[PDB]
RNA sequence: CAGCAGCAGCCUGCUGCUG
RNA sequence: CAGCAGCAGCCUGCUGCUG
């Protein structure tokens, strides 16, 4: 399957996660999780994120309106399907959802959501 | 029950809705729906919204971090409960969710979400 | 707009288990 | 971090019905 994502997954092993836990706290995780769902099919990423401007830039590059539309168009036809973006960081989940006919507006709200969550003050 | 909302519901009757439908389109609804959930209990509003600055100001006043905390604190105790804000406008739904311990950050993201959705270009 | 039903997903909270 | 299970809600899409 063609993913909407432009960067590889970065999930930590169980050992790396434990080590990070011993060293640090829910407000300073290794990163964030995000996902894109098109009908039944869901694509997921855990991406490292350290709250710098460099890191923000890098992770905002993990998908675009174009990469999402290319991935999503595989699943399209005459009938509308449900499409959903989710992101979770520091205890808060944001989900942006609606039909395929609205996908451009779902991307616009998804990217704005992602940016505001990742920049939310301590 | 004490609501998190500071303005009354504005749901249209079935007849008003039909009349509006005959006169206008999903991109020009009478307004938007939003809701706040605390554990099992959900509070809901349909609010008129006409995409002016005056109207934006008015509807952004429908809840505050304080009104949400007063309402939500009724349901609190030692264990965390789930808390959720949702808003739907013009085919797109945004939901912001997490545990009561995070409620201040849920409000901050909820209000930012609401503002961006209600201002999204045609 | 609202309520009801069938189907299909998704997210949140709680509890327990595994790695 | 990941997978599994019990419970409780929520949102999206499709289909049908009512007002």
Set out the fold topology.
The structure is a homodimer of 122-residue chains.
Chain A lengths: L13 H10 L7 E8 L2 E8 L4 H8 L4 H9 L8 E8 L2 E8 L3 H16 L4
The structure holds a RNA duplex (19 and 19 nucleotides).
GO molecular function (chains A, B): RNA binding
Protein name (chains A, B): RNA silencing suppressor p19
Function (chains A, B): Viral suppressor of RNA silencing which binds specifically to silencing RNAs (siRNAs). Acts as a molecular caliper to specifically select siRNAs based on the length of the duplex region of the RNA.
Walk me through the structure.
Chains A, B: GO terms for molecular function: RNA binding. Chains A, B: Homodimer. Chains A, B: Keywords: Host-virus interaction, Inhibition of host innate immune response by virus, RNA-binding, Suppressor of RNA silencing, Viral immunoevasion. The structure is a homodimer of 122-residue chains. Chain A has 122 residues and is of the alpha+beta class. The first copy, chain A, has one domain (12-122): RNA silencing suppressor P19 (Enolase-like, domain 1), CATH 3.30.390.180. Chain A contains 4 helices and 4 strands, in the order H-E-E-H-H-E-E-H. Chain A has helices at residues 14-23, 53-60, 65-73, 103-118, and strands spanning 31-38, 41-48, 82-89, 92-99. A 4-stranded antiparallel sheet of chain A has the order 2-1-3-4, with helices on one face. In chain A, strand 1 (31-38) and strand 2 form a beta hairpin. Chain A is elongated and about 50 Å long. The N and C termini of chain A lie far apart (38 Å). Strand 4 of chain A pairs antiparallel with strand 4 of chain B, so a sheet runs across the interface. The structure holds a RNA duplex (19 and 19 nucleotides).
